[PDB]
Amino acid sequence: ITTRNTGLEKLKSMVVSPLYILVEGLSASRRSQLVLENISNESDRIQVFHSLIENHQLFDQCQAPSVCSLVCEALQLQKKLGKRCTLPCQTLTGLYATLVFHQLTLKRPSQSALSQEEQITLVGLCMMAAEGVWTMRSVFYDDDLKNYSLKESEILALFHMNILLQVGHNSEQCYVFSHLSLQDFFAALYYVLEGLEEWNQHFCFDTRLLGMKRFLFGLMNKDILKTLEVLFEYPVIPTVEQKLQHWVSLIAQQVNGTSPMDTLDAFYCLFESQDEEFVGGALKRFQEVWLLINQKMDLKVSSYCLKHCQNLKAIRVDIRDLLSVDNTLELCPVVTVQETQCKPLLMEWWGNFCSVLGSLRNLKELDLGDSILSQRAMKILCLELRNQSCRIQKLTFKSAEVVSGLKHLWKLLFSNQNLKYLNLGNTPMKDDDMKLACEALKHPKCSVETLRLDSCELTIIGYEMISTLLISTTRLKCLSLAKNRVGVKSMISLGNALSSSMCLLQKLILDNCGLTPASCHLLVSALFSNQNLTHLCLSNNSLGTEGVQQLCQFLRNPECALQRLILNHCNIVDDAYGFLAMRLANNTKLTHLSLTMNPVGDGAMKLLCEALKEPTCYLQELELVDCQLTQNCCEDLACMITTTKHLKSLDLGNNALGDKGVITLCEGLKQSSSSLRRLGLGACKLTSNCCEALSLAISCNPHLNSLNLVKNDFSTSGMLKLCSAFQCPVSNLGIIGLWKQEYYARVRRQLEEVEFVKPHVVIDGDWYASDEDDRNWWKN
């Protein structure tokens, strides 16, 4: 069997145990030599030839000897038509169209409008080309020609070159084009032709589609449209252009973000048509681009398309392998294309791409993903980012392996005075690297305020240099040290630095460190004298009772000015709950508190809610997710909710409140004296009985804003009741977290009706993603 790659989709089914041997045409080196021969070599040979070679689809077409010959002769034509053709020829669509236009002029005695009879023939043959493309038929029987009033002799006479040749060995005859590329080009030509004029009166009636789509995108070139207007004396305005713009805009916007593959495919499609207005109109609403690069053609198309992206602000680009190595020299042809460029082609293209990236003004965030950069790679990236016009203010390397170019990174830090936020993570950091980084940070030119080191290996010497950096005069306001084992002597060294009055640090993060109850006590005692620390985080580190007592003593001291205190997965004793409640009874300037995976009994819950009931409480947010809770404390919870006047956010997690507990909670809520906004219930073992009370409470809760119900069994009727409660005009519930896949058709239709009624209601499974206030400052 011999057939095309497209035809194997059907054939693989009926044939039993087949064998596949693929047939290939011209070799890459021979094709390169042949193309190099045709190049005019007038000061643009290197760039044009390199643009030609990287295009994979172009070389797939050029693999055909006939297509290669067509490309060669078209290139020869461009030499003679130096001034006649103004457009450049870096694409197959432009070259094929140029040959068609030049051939038509050969038939014409002079440049003139087409006659009426030949226009009908041309539109007819183009429309059978489109019909063959869509119907997947290529025999092109003579019956079809007479159906649309076509004659082969006329077609061959007017075109003046071999199109749709027919050979009949038997009585019947069949018509085949010179190549499938010409047929697809003619179908694309028809796709613009129908709009200009109606020709139905004279007539008497997805890999393959990818070529048609590419040809259609290429045909939107203004020069081709102007040329077609010249041949047909009618201005050309196609209706498919609006559809293409609409498709690109639809790709641009999505709820969960932009898929990189679709973005790169759109970039490829737009780069085919060399029109600045077309791409500019097509792309305006991205605002965020995620890009994956695996070939130099990707770099070129991204550099071409990013110029017209004047709206985006965040970019994420991943290049895993193209710069894993720093130096590598090989030659494809027998004789080098250029005698001595002193630089291989990849580096110049990546330099241009990075210059384009740094040239943008609207862009202020940069992320490198999981890029693996060599030394020269990180050097050239830093050199391009060194541009003064660049206004990028954030850099991220938490997943990038750039340890070789850490010196270049340090050189970049002080040179650019504009950036503020700097993040480093999972980069093994050595002693001389710490010294260079600290020296760079000490430089007055540095304006970086936030610096993070997560899972960055640290030494005792590293700890002492860090302390010396902190005691030194810098502009660092925020700092973090997570997943780093810290020695008690190193901890003592850090504590001494903090107790100094000259230190001005507002946010300090310590997660998964080597803190011990003695170490925690020493740290709190050192922090007692400090007064400039507003945000403090301590998680996953065991804390003793004396540590909590000393922390409460520090809190009682005025000038503390500590707003947010976060503690999770650190064991807290019963007596410590008493100290916390006593602080909460008369507390100011303490808004947010968190306690998660902490053993809290029901009696401790009663003590806490009594402490909250006191009017001298300013605690906006309280989080208690995995604290073991039962149904008894729910009545006191409802009472404190009713009495409390300042609690805004309340969250509960895996604790099993129970059906009666939720009933009591909703009874307390329906009275609606409380002004709380966010309520969270997840895996609380809910039933359908509490849904009636929940709907009743919502029906008279204009204050309630957000709600979550996930991992809870809800029957169908409960879903109808809750949807009806949502639809009521009194309810103002905007953020709702539920999984739509779990429910039946009627519930989905009801939720769609809710979205129709209220345009500002959004239902999404990821409830924690929404942040009305900065809650993940430590998590980042």
């Binding site: 139905n200 589609l209 593959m261 989080e623 991992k711 896949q741 039946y744």
Partner: protein
Amino acid sequence: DPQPVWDAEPQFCQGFLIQGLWELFMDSRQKNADKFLKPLSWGSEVLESSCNQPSTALWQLERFTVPQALQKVRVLKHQELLLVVAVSSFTRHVFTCSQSGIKVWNLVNQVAEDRDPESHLKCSVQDNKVYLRTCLLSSNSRTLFAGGYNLPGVIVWDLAAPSLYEKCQLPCEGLSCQALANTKENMALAGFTDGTVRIWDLRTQEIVRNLKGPTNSARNLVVKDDNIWTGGLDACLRCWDLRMAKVSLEHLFQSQIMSLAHSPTEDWLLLGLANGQHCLFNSRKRDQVLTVDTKDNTILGLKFSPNGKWWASVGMGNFITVHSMPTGAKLFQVPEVGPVRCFDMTENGRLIITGSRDCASVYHIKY
């Protein structure tokens, strides 16, 4: 009152553009916001972003991950009811098992509805009447097993060779392959209706061991290097070690047993009874069995997560339920119109395949 509504699933951007271009041609010849699902990138990943969590995890405990929701991406069409499915995540080749025919599909191509398989294999051509009930895959993906009721043997296909061919018939004339099993060892295991288990070596194709028991006791079989587990209508539970070649434990139940499961990282044994009770047993201490979950509908299939945290159940009552190991409570729910017979899971933990009616469906996991 389910009242279920069915919509095209992928709504892929390429399909939308193709549909848009098709309409324009029909309009020309007639005279005579929008939401799209992310495609399966290269058939391996979806390339989505993970969901946020209320709190950070411990430094030591990074690998432990649990799922939240399941989203379907593709539907595989077979005119007959399907019984088993296979994943083969390494080769991206999904196998669908039905009563009459078997088909092989590849996940590289992007399409809403797949009707043309890459390979179609039928056992009914060889013999007059062939009824197929069982199938199995090897971890190395070098062998494919398929057992039948009236089919005299079991046929092995190898995916390493450039072409698919039959290795050995391995006949069991009087015994219908109710149960089919395989191990890391080259050794083959199978159970049949008459309480008989016969055992062959693939390299040499010889019978090495035979086991006998009461009728209907070979409905289920669990394989381990040092543990062979057997139960059926009788509800007797027997654990056998080939080394000292004797039954280790005997257990009795009130009803029949259909579903068994094992956990790789640490042994746990899951039991599914006719009255719908899930019983968990640990194979280290060997003391006692305990039950924590009860379902009204009979449970037919079961599977465990590669990480060792969650297990999903498929039963008669057209429901899919996923639980967790610490308590046995369910964490999310996805129902389907048809009675779900089979289930599957991926070693990578990114995809999942389930089939109830004649056609099969492929879902995607979110973490």
